[PDB]
Amino acid sequence: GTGVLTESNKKFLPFQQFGRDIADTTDAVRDPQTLEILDITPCSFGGVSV
Amino acid sequence: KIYSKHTPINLGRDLPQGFSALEPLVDLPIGINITRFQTLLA
Ligand SMILES: *[C@@H]1O[C@H](CO)[C@@H](O)[C@H](O)[C@H]1NC(C)=O
Ligand SMILES: *[C@@H]1O[C@H](CO)[C@@H](O)[C@H](O)[C@H]1NC(C)=O
């Protein structure tokens, strides 16, 4: 994927590895190495009108 | 798949009234056929 990884205060239970949105898109992951909880946000975007 | 929960209740009215989810602490790749089960006592 593509996005910004941020430190999150989400409380994963120890067995959980992922976290998804309403549209079944992942918004939180667990680091396989350091066991960190990383929130994933899409990069900055927006409509442009002339 | 084994799910466990330890809920210290105070009423003691057999199974209590309420909600308590169970978490998958144990999963074993046993691959066997299970039809009958029994418990163990000391
Ligand atoms: C894998 O990386 C983690 C984090 O650095 C470390 O704690 C762990 O010991 C490593 N495992 C091996 C097999 O080197
Ligand atoms: C397990 O054994 C029973 C016989 O008691 C059989 O009917 C069944 O097909 C076997 N396999 C299962 C339950 O997957």
Side-chain angles (χ1 to χ4, degrees):
Chain A
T2 307
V4 185
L5 311 173
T6 317
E7 277 192 24
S8 66
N9 55 298
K10 284 170 175 159
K11 299 297 168 286
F12 289 174
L13 277 296
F15 62 95
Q16 286 164 342
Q17 303 287 117
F18 285 112
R20 304 170 104 83
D21 262 2
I22 314 295
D24 273 10
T25 62
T26 314
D27 71 332
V29 288
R30 158 161 276 160
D31 205 305
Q33 302 211 19
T34 178
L35 273 300
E36 275 181 44
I37 320 292
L38 312 179
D39 262 347
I40 300 173
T41 57
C43 304
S44 176
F45 67 98
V48 173
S49 314
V50 161
Chain B
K1 322 182 174 298
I2 303 177
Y3 306 85
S4 171
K5 199 56 172 183
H6 287 60
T7 48
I9 69 176
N10 294 347
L11 71 173
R13 268 70 182 182
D14 295 348
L15 303 176
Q17 299 220 16
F19 271 93
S20 188
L22 281 72
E23 318 167 3
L25 75 165
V26 170
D27 202 353
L28 310 165
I30 190 167
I32 69 155
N33 191 349
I34 302 169
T35 308
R36 175 214 293 108
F37 87 108
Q38 310 187 4
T39 74
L40 271 72
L41 272 301

